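Practice problem. Given the sequence and the SMILES for magnesium ion, write out the predicted structure.
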Amino acid sequence: MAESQVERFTFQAEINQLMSLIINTFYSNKEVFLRELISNASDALDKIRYQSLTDASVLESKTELEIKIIPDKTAKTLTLIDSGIGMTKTDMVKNLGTIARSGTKNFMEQLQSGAADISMIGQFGVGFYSAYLVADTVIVHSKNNDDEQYVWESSAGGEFTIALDHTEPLGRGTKIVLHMKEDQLDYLDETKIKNLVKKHSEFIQYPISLLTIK
Ligand SMILES: [Mg+2]
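Answer key:
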């Protein structure tokens, strides 16, 4: 019998409102979700790479600096794995929903008015939540050199959980798994996702591997 300690957290009020707005509103073009996944991976890779310039030992946990993208139609998931800096448990708590972001209120105001559209979400410091444009549930597995591997999960509804993760060790970095909404499954089509990755990785300075499940 397996045992797991799970901790529940509540999203900061405006983040919760943003998630509701992202989930319960129609958006014609949701491609920004992929831009934001890749950008977060690139930022995490930069962070560990620059740390390695001043402390080479930080790469011992995983020498490669790369991104892997895995569309899986049977599972109805899109997965993106980076070997960036990773998040400790408290990093997840602080960065993935409990702490207010300066731009959340202003973004929602500009969405409501028409001053901004959904593609601009990254400019407002809340890009991560774009995953909920296309996914019902988001699962974030992460391993930072300073902590054990943890998994964050949320289907929105105002809460998320974090638990120790005993699934496939990452060595270092982050694996984000999007459980795709029925009406967004086209994003798992081989040519569609290949093109989207090309389009949204033009200036990315790390190798990307894109799988297709036969
Ligand atoms: Mg980001």
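Check your answer against the key. Residues 1-214 form a domain with the Heat Shock Protein 90 fold (CATH 3.30.565.10).
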